[PDB]
């Protein structure tokens with residue numbers, strides 16, 4: 120019951136290079152890393168995770184962020200994976216799966232991938248399952 124005052128601007132605005140959407144900060148990193156190594160990068164900077172896409176509007180924001188970067192990349196990592204290889208999907212942040220956006224023929228049963236990327240052919244709006252050892256660029260999400 121000491122400092123009962125209003126939030127400073129650092130808790131309402133996101134830092135240079137990152138963009139705000141509904142109380143979180145987001146950024147696209149063009150470094151090509153495995154899914155696990157990408158999630159670790161996100162954890163190391165302001166205690167985030169690979170992005171979790173929980174609504175259609177959040178998916179539209181993330182797609183716009185990637186397009187605005189000017190990247191020529193085909194695949195971008197998001198935080199969804201199948202850890203027990205039994206087609207039960209989880210977000211690395213622990214959030215519930217409240218939204219899905221699978222592309223045509225996904226998730227595959229005939230040549231299954233266990234990690235998920237956004238595809239450039241769909242304007243970064245639809246998802247594909249791919250091997251977790253692939254090296255792709257990625258989007259991080261962190262609270263602030």
Ligand SMILES: *[C@H]1O[C@H](CO[C@]2(C(=O)O)C[C@H](O)[C@@H](NC(C)=O)[C@H]([C@H](O)[C@H](O)CO)O2)[C@@H](O)[C@H](O[C@@H]2O[C@H](CO)[C@H](O)[C@H](O)[C@H]2O)[C@H]1NC(C)=O
Pocket residue numbers: 120121122123124125126127
């Ligand atoms: C809210 O502000 C607390 C500091 O407040 C003054 C101060 O005494 O320094 C209150 C003054 O009215 C104000 N003066 C003017 C003219 O605005 C100043 C200035 O706003 C400030 O100097 C910037 O120039 O602030 C701030 O430190 C407090 O923080 C927290 O304090 C708690 C401790 O009791 C606990 O440590 C919190 O975890 C910590 O964030 C600020 N509150 C929040 C939620 O950020």
